[PDB]
């Protein structure tokens, strides 16, 4: 009795083909910038999830966003900084600018590029079918890039997507749970907010990969097209799989449990029991029908699969018909 090993379908050994220092964050020596160069303007309010500030970098007068990280392990701080530096410049990924410690708290602070405060959460339930397609493809750009750079985000959810309303500039943020993918590495199942936890985390399948981000994105998509926030509404980690099972059916769940020989608690197995597969047309109602099309259902169907290996890659996702017209967007800004 033992869980079978798994491998990522794409970008499998990207980190291996790179030098050690690219992914060996525990050896990274953190370069510090001057605190006296940054002055905080106003508390930008991450909804009391974190300490986010507007700040002026006085040495160049430019505006910066400063986040003071809640006191975590030295290991996890090293990770994020190395991840952000490596990902710097990529499409729709927050640009890290400086690393500073606060003198009145001894707490590390991250400095980011110009950001206007609009959380995707309070927007994604009121947007056109076209703009759902537009921003989804923008997120994919970030995820395809960061996966190719050997990094799983591990907290894909609308609260961690920031959108500049007026410029339509989308930045994927919150890389505090992000981790370098290495073939054959066991990863923590504690990552990701429950509503966006993939089946792999929910069954304790520990050798998952980038394909985790794609499930979460499927949950985000499901939320937008059906106007159900959130789509899978688990009141419990166990109930989260129940809510999933009541939609995709239990059959394919037991294929997934069998395939990778995952040992699931026979008591949890009892509660899961037998649920039939539901077609998405049953989530369709008057309010959301205009936000739903066959290509939307097809894409989502190819994201919300139990078997992580059978979910679309970020690249395969960017080539789906669902985004066919939106790739030709004419960047109208009013
Ligand atoms: Cl962030
Ligand atoms: Cl692996
Ligand atoms: Cl990918």
């Amino acid at each position: 009795s033992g869980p079978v090993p798994s491998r990522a379908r794409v970008y499998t050994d990207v980190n291996t083909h790179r030098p050690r220092e690219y992914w060996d964050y525990e050896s990274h020596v953190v370069e510090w910038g001057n605190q006296d160069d940054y002055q905080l303007v106003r508390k930008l309010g991450r909804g009391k999830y974190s300490e986010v500030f507007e700040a002026i970098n006085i040495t160049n007068n430019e505006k910066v966003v400063v986040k003071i990280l809640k006191p975590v392990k030295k290991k996890k701080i090293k990770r994020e900084i190395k991840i952000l530096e490596n990902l710097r410049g990529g499409p729709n990924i927050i640009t890290l600018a400086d690393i500073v410690k606060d003198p009145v708290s001894r707490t590390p602070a991250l400095v980011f590029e110009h950001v206007n405060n609009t959380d995707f959460k309070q927007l994604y339930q009121t947007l056109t079918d076209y703009d759902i397609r537009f921003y989804m493809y923008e997120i994919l750009k970030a995820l395809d890039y960061c996966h190719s750079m050997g990094i799983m985000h591990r907290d894909v959810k609308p609260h961690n997507v920031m959108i500049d309303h007026e410029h339509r500039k989308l930045r994927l943020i919150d890389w505090g749970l992000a981790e370098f993918y290495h073939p054959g590495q066991e990863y923590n199942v504690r990552v990701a907010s429950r509503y966006f936890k993939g089946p792999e985390l929910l069954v304790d399948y520990q050798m998952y990969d980038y394909s985790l981000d794609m499930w979460s994105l499927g949950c985000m998509l499901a939320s937008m097209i059906f106007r159900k926030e959130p789509f899978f509404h688990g009141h419990d980690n166990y109930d989260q799989l129940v809510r999933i099972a009541k939609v995709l059916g239990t059959e394919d769940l037991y294929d997934y449990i069998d395939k990778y020989n995952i040992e699931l608690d026979p008591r949890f197995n009892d509660i899961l029991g037998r649920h039939s597969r539901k077609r998405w047309e049953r989530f369709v109602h008057s309010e959301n029908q205009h936000l739903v099309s066959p290509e939307a259902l097809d894409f989502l169907d190819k994201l919300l699969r139990y078997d992580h290996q059978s979910r679309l890659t970020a690249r395969e996702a960017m080539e789906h018909p669902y985004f066919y017209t939106v790739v030709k967007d004419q960047a109208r800004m009013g």
Side-chain angles (χ1 to χ4, degrees):
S1 56
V4 183
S6 178
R7 289 297 199 270
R9 192 150 61 76
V10 284
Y11 312 129
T12 320
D13 270 277
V14 289
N15 283 316
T16 305
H17 306 315
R18 294 168 205 269
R20 176 174 74 123
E21 18 289 313
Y22 175 90
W23 52 266
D24 194 7
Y25 55 91
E26 291 192 300
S27 301
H28 183 267
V29 180
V30 173
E31 211 84 2
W32 302 100
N34 200 321
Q35 63 284 323
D36 298 319
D37 300 359
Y38 302 103
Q39 293 180 330
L40 307 182
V41 180
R42 59 202 180 83
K43 208 163 189 161
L44 291 187
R46 206 75 212 87
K48 190 42 220 158
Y49 186 80
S50 40
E51 289 280 309
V52 178
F53 292 91
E54 198 196 85
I56 301 159
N57 177 15
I58 64 159
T59 53
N60 64 10
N61 292 315
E62 286 146 16
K63 282 184 196 171
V64 295
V65 162
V66 170
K67 167 182 267 179
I68 303 162
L69 300 89
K70 39 171 69 174
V72 293
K73 296 173 190 177
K74 323 167 212 303
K75 183 173 75 174
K76 285 187 199 182
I77 298 159
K78 285 192 168 199
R79 188 173 68 184
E80 187 176 335
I81 280 150
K82 189 66 203 155
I83 286 178
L84 286 171
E85 282 164 333
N86 294 354
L87 285 176
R88 203 192 190 189
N92 301 338
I93 295 174
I94 193 150
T95 306
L96 178 78
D98 209 308
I99 310 134
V100 176
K101 198 91 75 171
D102 195 290
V104 206
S105 293
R106 273 301 289 174
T107 324
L110 294 180
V111 182
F112 296 110
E113 250 67 337
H114 182 94
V115 168
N116 298 22
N117 286 140
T118 314
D119 198 305
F120 195 43
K121 178 208 158 181
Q122 287 198 5
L123 190 67
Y124 82 139
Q125 298 289 315
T126 335
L127 221 40
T128 53
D129 174 54
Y130 186 91
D131 272 1
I132 289 169
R133 296 170 197 237
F134 179 78
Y135 294 123
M136 282 294 289
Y137 183 84
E138 294 304 311
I139 301 160
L140 280 164
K141 265 196 276 164
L143 283 177
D144 193 28
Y145 178 86
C146 84
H147 287 165
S148 77
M149 296 289 294
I151 295 142
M152 317 167 286
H153 185 276
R154 311 205 295 177
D155 209 18
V156 168
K157 66 168 175 180
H159 220 81
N160 290 343
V161 175
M162 290 290 285
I163 290 167
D164 185 292
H165 152 77
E166 208 169 14
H167 300 81
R168 304 156 76 215
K169 277 184 174 177
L170 181 148
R171 292 281 186 281
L172 181 60
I173 69 158
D174 262 21
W175 295 85
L177 304 179
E179 184 53 297
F180 299 93
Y181 173 76
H182 304 116
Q185 193 168 320
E186 312 284 28
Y187 290 102
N188 197 359
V189 298
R190 269 193 78 256
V191 303
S193 313
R194 190 198 292 113
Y195 302 142
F196 303 89
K197 268 178 153 76
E200 53 266 59
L201 312 183
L202 298 173
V203 304
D204 287 338
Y205 192 75
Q206 204 141 339
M207 205 180 281
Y208 62 92
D209 59 68
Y210 311 111
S211 211
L212 182 74
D213 287 336
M214 299 307 281
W215 171 273
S216 311
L217 180 83
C219 295
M220 250 198 50
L221 177 66
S223 170
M224 285 174 289
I225 69 163
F226 295 125
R227 292 282 191 251
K228 189 171 188 177
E229 176 183 20
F231 189 70
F232 300 111
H233 190 74
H235 289 226
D236 198 331
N237 264 4
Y238 297 99
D239 181 55
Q240 183 68 24
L241 195 72
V242 168
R243 304 276 167 156
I244 291 159
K246 286 181 174 181
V247 174
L248 311 177
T250 52
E251 179 208 34
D252 299 352
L253 176 61
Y254 301 133
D255 291 325
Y256 184 57
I257 293 163
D258 178 279
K259 170 169 176 168
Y260 297 97
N261 192 37
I262 311 155
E263 289 288 332
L264 203 82
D265 200 312
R267 272 90 185 190
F268 183 34
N269 191 34
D270 286 329
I271 279 85
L272 287 168
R274 268 288 152 197
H275 292 295
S276 65
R277 196 205 191 124
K278 300 286 183 299
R279 47 205 293 251
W280 287 274
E281 289 83 349
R282 276 187 148 265
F283 302 100
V284 175
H285 286 105
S286 65
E287 53 272 16
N288 62 41
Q289 47 204 27
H290 78 272
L291 301 167
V292 184
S293 58
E295 67 267 22
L297 300 172
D298 197 76
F299 180 46
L300 183 85
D301 181 35
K302 288 157 191 279
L303 287 176
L304 293 180
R305 303 278 168 94
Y306 288 108
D307 195 343
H308 52 289
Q309 207 209 328
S310 61
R311 301 169 204 155
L312 297 181
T313 74
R315 179 43 58 183
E316 284 156 12
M318 286 167 81
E319 294 161 338
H320 195 271
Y322 182 57
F323 301 115
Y324 190 84
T325 298
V326 86
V327 290
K328 326 181 202 299
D329 179 72
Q330 296 293 95
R332 168 187 288 273
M333 306 292 161

